[PDB]
């Protein structure tokens, strides 16, 4: 629960997995994949944020699955391929900050993981046009019902074009470890480019 | 749950209600914890970190921290826009505030800085938030120096870079999750701080 130069890895991704695995191992942390996905609309510079679940890392960055077509976050990203996510483990007094450029995950993978999702979920994807305005619950259910009936005669439910994965290619990753002393341990890895060697530094809390 | 009937006129009412419930709930041990998101306006780079919500005032949501030298200060400086999320895991609730930022009154800033513990007051001075340092040692050297610097002093002065900042809401969303995945979503909006609030139901 302390963080020092000695513990730092070469690839920040190592220290992430270590910390993440510890969070999953810890029974105090009941939802370690929960994160805050922040985005912003580039022309105006308006910031929006919401809670999502981190899915997994891949060859290039951090991946998260949701509706990246019609939702608010989709419209921000569409105008500005930049995003930030925070992992906050209250009890472990740890917080990880990832900040990088966004990329749409492979259409195959997007579909692959969409299949694993429960049937009720697969259908919900279709029925709900995330972030769109509606009249009420009724309108919502009417849609669920219609779709549940629409795909009733069908083994595997198809994946919507607007649903899938998106990945954040890190340009900055910060490992923050709090101490009741208020003098928390702060370390941040950075590279101006996805092709620049990572650089670690200690930040004042 | 969450239905049209429960909606208030001033979103701020529904907020307090929800917040008070979170404080009342022993499951929610840190209901003031929030994610404060900001973005550097020219480049459009997004940064975010965890902070504590302090309280509302006549105009918006206030948070106290270093709004001068820190990363968030540099984002806000270039783009007076921010967003914060309140997430109460157990209550299955999340509140989203999105508005323009404003620097809280210098008096208030100082007033609340006084209430903070002495160790804290000193820490504000010693630590140049987000600045790069060599190691813990450099840090402590600074703490020690400041602890000694302000040793001969009753009340410790407030740094210019420390204080409060408020978010004047343009969008407030009340999200209530249901294991059914068909969460209740309501969002209040006004294009301007002088435009009547407007409630609407969003698809989950
Ligand atoms: C713990 C938690 C997990 C969530 N996971 C997801 C998810 O995997 N996919 C998704 O689309 N929305 C998810 N949501 C919903 C979003 O927080 C929220 O509905 C948001 O509005 C979605 O996009 P928007 O901000 O662009 O409207 C989750 C919410 C919570 C509280
Ligand atoms: C639970 C929690 C509460 C925090 N509260 C505060 C706070 O009240 N003020 C502050 O300046 N930083 C606070 N921090 C630290 C910030 O999240 C983080 O160090 C951030 O980097 C500060 O500003 P920056 O993003 O501009 O560097 C808190 C962190 C955690 C995990």
**φ, ψ (nearest 5 deg) of residue B113:** -65, -35
Distances (CA, A) of A103 to A48, A67, A107, B114: 18, 14, 12, 46
CB atoms within 10 A of CB B164: 23
| A88 close to A176: Cβ distance less than 8 angstroms | no
Q: Which entry of A97, A107, A182, A191 is annotated as an active-site residue?
A: A182
| A128 close to A68: Cβ distance less than 8 angstroms | no
Write out residues 145-174 of A within 8 Å (CB-CB) of B.
none
Q: Give the residues across from B56 on adjacent strands.
A: B61
| A175 close to B112: Cβ distance less than 8 angstroms | no
- Which one, of A131, A142, B84, lies nearest residue B76 by Cα? B84
d(CA B192, CA A47): 15
DSSP secondary structure string for all residues of chain B: ---GGG--SSHHHHHHHHHHHHHH-SS-S-TTEEEEEEEETTTTEEEEEEEE--EE-SSSEEEEEE-SSSHHHHHHHH--EEEEEEEETTTTEEEEEEEEEEEPPHHHHHHHHHHS-HHHHHHHHH--TT-EES-HHHHHHHHHHHHHHTTS-SSPPPPTTEEEEEEEEEEEEEEE--TTS--EEEEEE-SSTTS--EEEEE--
Q: Would the CB of A78 count as within 6 Å of ligand 1?
A: no
Torsion on CA atoms B101, B51, B69, B47, rounded to nearest 10: -80
d(CA A176, CA A184): 7
Breaks (C-N over 2.5 A) in chain B follow: none
Q: Is A135 annotated as a binding residue?
A: no
Distances (CA, A) of A147 to A18, A114, A116, A123, B204: 42, 17, 19, 7, 16
Contacts of A133 in chain B (CB under 8 A): 200-203
Contacts of B182 in chain A (CB under 8 A): 124, 128, 137, 140-141, 144
Q: Is A104 annotated as a binding residue?
A: no
Using the beta-carbon criterion (under 8 Å), do B38 and A47 form an inter-chain contact? yes
- Which one, of A10, A39, A163, A27, lies nearest residue A101 by Cα? A39
CB atoms within 10 A of CB A149: 10
Using the beta-carbon criterion (under 8 Å), do A34 and B202 form an inter-chain contact? no
Q: Give the residues across from A48 on adjacent strands.
A: A39
Breaks (C-N over 2.5 A) in chain A follow: none
d(CA A175, CA A196): 19
Q: Is B136 annotated as a binding residue?
A: no
Q: Give the residues across from B82 on adjacent strands.
A: B99
Using the beta-carbon criterion (under 8 Å), do A38 and B48 form an inter-chain contact? yes
Half-sphere exposure of B133 (CA within 13 A, CB side): 24
Task: Assess whether A129 carries a catalytic annotation.
Answer: no
Q: What is the 3-state secondary structure (H, E, C) of chain A?
A: CCCCHHHCCCCHHHHHHHHHHHHHHCCCCCCCCEEEEEEEECCCCEEEEEEEECCEECCCCEEEEEECCCCHHHHHHHHCCEEEEEEEECCCCEEEEEEEEEEECCHHHHHHHHHHCCHHHHHHHHHCCCCCEECCHHHHHHHHHHHHHHCCCCCCCCCCCCEEEEEEEEEEEEEEECCCCCCCEEEEEECCCCCCCCEEEEECC
CB atoms within 10 A of CB A27: 7
Write down the CATH number for the domain with range A1-205: 2.30.110.10
- Which one, of A65, A54, A59, lies nearest residue A166 by Cα? A65
Contacts of A47 in chain B (CB under 8 A): 37-39, 46, 81-83, 98
Long-range contacts of A123-128 (CB under 8 A, 24+ apart): A123/A147, A123/A148, A123/A151, A123/A157, A124/B181, A124/B182, A125/A67, A125/A159, A125/A160, A125/A163, A126/A150, A126/A151, A126/A157, A126/A160, A128/B182, A128/B203, A128/B204
Expt. technique = X-ray
**Optimal mutation site among A5, A8, A45, interface B, most CBs of chain B within 10 A:** A45
| B94 close to B87: Cβ distance less than 8 angstroms | yes
CATH topology of domain B1-204: Pnp Oxidase; Chain A (2.30.110)
């Amino acid at each position: 629960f302390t963080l020092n130069e000695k513990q730092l890895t070469d690839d920040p991704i190592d220290l992430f997995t270590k910390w993440f695995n510890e969070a999953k191992e810890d029974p105090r942390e009941t939802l370690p994949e929960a994160i805050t996905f922040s985005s912003a609309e580039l022309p105006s510079g308006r910031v929006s944020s919401r809670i999502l679940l981190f899915k997994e890392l891949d060859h290039r960055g951090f991946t998260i699955y949701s509706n990246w077509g019609t939702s608010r976050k989709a419209h921000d990203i569409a105008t500005n391929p930049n995003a930030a996510i925070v992992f906050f483990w209250k009890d472990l007094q740890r917080q990880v900050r990832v900040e990088g450029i966004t990329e749409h995950v492979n259409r195959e993978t997007s579909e692959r993981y969409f299949k694993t999702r429960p049937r009720g979920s697969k259908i919900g994807a279709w029925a709900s046009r995330q972030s769109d305005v509606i009249k009420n619950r009724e309108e919502l259910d009417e849609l669920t019902q219609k779709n549940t009936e629409r795909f009733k005669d069908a083994e595997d439910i198809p994946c919507p074009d607007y649903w899938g994965g998106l990945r954040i290619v890190p340009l900055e990753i910060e490992f923050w470890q709090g101490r009741p002393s208020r003098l928390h341990d702060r370390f941040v890895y950075r590279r101006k480019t996805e092709n620049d060697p990572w650089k670690v530094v200690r930040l004042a809390p």
